[PDB]
């Protein structure tokens with residue numbers, strides 16, 4: 510059972526959890542209520558397990574794509590911001606957290622992947638994916654590579670798979686059609702084939718993950734990476750002079766990152782729903798609260814208009830929004846789970862050579878539309 514008279518918060522380990530705990534400390538100073546911030550391994554998989562028995566945190570942070578599944582399962586409370594509070598955030602961010610007519614979380618930040626480049630290694634970043642192999646060939650002479658990014662999580666490869674026509678679920682007749690999936694169309698295959706060709710030509714390695722890519726970029730070993738705003742503060746601390754820019758085009762079309770809205774949901778089993786609302790509305794979603802988290806690990810563009818206005822001038826934030834505008838906001842529908850897990854398997858199998866691109870994506874399409 511969840512303890513009454515305290516708040517327990519779960520947030521992903523790549524986010525500014527120490528900054529969030531500082532907001533928790535302010536809450537405690539004011540109200541005497543203890544806030545415990547945790548970053549469990551695989552929290553987004555553990556949550557539906559424990560919440561189903563009336564357990565888990567009072568508040569869970571994730572991108573909104575997970576939240577439709579949680580709400581469908583009865584695991585999230587309807588949030589009750591008044592009109593004046595809703596007016597403080599951008600309308601589209603509330604749309605991301607609306608499920609079957611109900612608001613089921615508070616939006617916090619708007620995340621998109623960008624191309625991150627070392628200004629000293631590549632003063633003029635490549636406008637196209639197609640030119641990157643030639644760039645790699647020149648950099649290899651100096652024992653450097655053109656690009657490294659996480660090939661284990663489909664989030665990072667999706668912008669290239671989507672570029673030429675890949676999609677998750679078609680929005681038709683005012684809703685996502687769960688039987689109209691675009692993972693094995695010609696566009697999707699063209700994008701994944703390009704990635705695989707990069708691997709075959711030794712521009713990248715199939716085993717590259719978040720840690721490997723991050724270490725290589727931040728140590729000046731690779732010229733470019735693909736990452737989101739949470740990554741910037743580690744690069745700030747590194748010796749690398751980096752820029753954040755538009756993702757490269759593929760076949761003349763923009764890369765299309767899936768846009769996530771970092772959101773805070775209240776456990777339907779929480780005996781602390783009022784405290785959660787007070788914390789989220791009156792502590793976190795303030796200039797001071799967001800600043801605390803943002804100083805720890807950057808949130809990106811934020812949902813809170815007053816604070817976003819202060820961030821807007823930063824070229825990294827401009828680049829984030831430019832990439833977001835080329836991409837699409839993720840569905841929050843339950844079937845996003847089927848989609849992501851199936852795509853994950855497809856990318857890993859194709860990259861490793863266990864399957865061809867065509868066979869991997871066809872199997873993903875069959876799995877998702879079951």
Ligand SMILES: C[C@H]1O[C@H](O[C@H]2[C@H](O)[C@@H](O)[C@@H](O[C@H]3[C@H](O)[C@@H](O)[C@@H](O)O[C@@H]3CO)O[C@@H]2CO)[C@H](O)[C@@H](O)[C@@H]1N[C@H]1C=C(CO)[C@@H](O)[C@H](O)[C@H]1O
Pocket residue numbers: 521523551553554572573574575620662663664665737769846849850853
């Ligand atoms: C396979 C994976 O799918 C789902 O994960 C997706 C997230 O739900 C999306 O929000 C997005 O995550 C990115 C965040 O939005 C962003 O803020 C940053 O944290 O980077 C994230 C990407 O690393 O994209 C994800 C897809 O890449 C689903 O929620 C998640 O549970 C699934 N991952 C699990 C699956 C396996 C395989 O059995 C395990 O290896 C993993 O440890 C699990 O986490």
